[PDB]
Structures are given as C-alpha cells and as structure tokens.
Amino acid sequence: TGTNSDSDLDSIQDEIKSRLDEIDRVSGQTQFNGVNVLAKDGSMKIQVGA
Amino acid sequence: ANRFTSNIKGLTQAARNANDGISVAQTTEGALSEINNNLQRIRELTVQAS
After folding, report:
1. What are the φ/ψ torsions at residue B6 (nearest 5 degrees)?
2. R_g of chain B computed on alpha carbons
3. Chain B nearest-CA residue for A47
4. How many degrees, rounded to 5, is the angle at CA B44 between CA B40 and CA B45?
5. A50 CB near a chain B CB, below 8 Å?
6. B9 vs chain A: nearest CA distance in angstroms?
7. β-sheet bridge partners, residue A36
8. CB distance A38 to A30 below 8 Å
9. Closest Cα partner for B50 from A33, A43, A48, A35?
10. What does the record give as the function of this protein (chain B)?
11. Is A34 exposed, middle or buried, given 0-12, 13-18 or 19+ CB atoms closer than 10 A?
C-alpha cells in the first residue's frame, strides 16, 4: 500500500529480512541422525525388497 | 569254512568303517551349518546396510 512512509517501510523490510534469515537457518540446520536433507539435490534409496 | 569266516569278518569291519564315515559326515555337516548361520547373518546385515 501507499499510506505508509519510508520510515514505516523500513520496519516491514527488516522484518522480512529477519524472516528470510530464519528460513535460510532452518533450511541449513535441519538434519536427521547426522545426515542433512535440505542441502543437496541427491536422491535417497530405501531397500524395501530384500 | 575259512573263506566263509574271512568274508564274514571283512563284512563286519566294513560295517564299522561305514559307521565311521557316517560320523565324519555328521561332523562336517555341523561345521557347514555353523558357517551357514554366519552367512545368513551377513545377508541380513547387508540388507540393512543397502
């Protein structure tokens, strides 16, 4: 919207920046038993056939 | 009579030898089964590691 001034826009901006930083953090620090899942494009294979 | 008794004693000794061979076979079978158990455990562990 256009009712908010630049001084009012910097607050929304830094909030968005903090949210993006949190997104990066949770994307890079989540791991299951020592192996990460959101850092590489590789695929996982599960032996389900004996 | 001498031929007869020689044949009889030979047959008795042969039966004893056959029993001994059966015992040898049983021992070897036991060893083979003991190896088979470890082979199956390796099979299961490989399936887990796959």
Report:
1. -60, -45
2. 22
3. B50
4. 115
5. yes
6. 57
7. A31
8. yes
9. A48
10. Flagellin is the subunit protein which polymerizes to form the filaments of bacterial flagella.
11. exposed
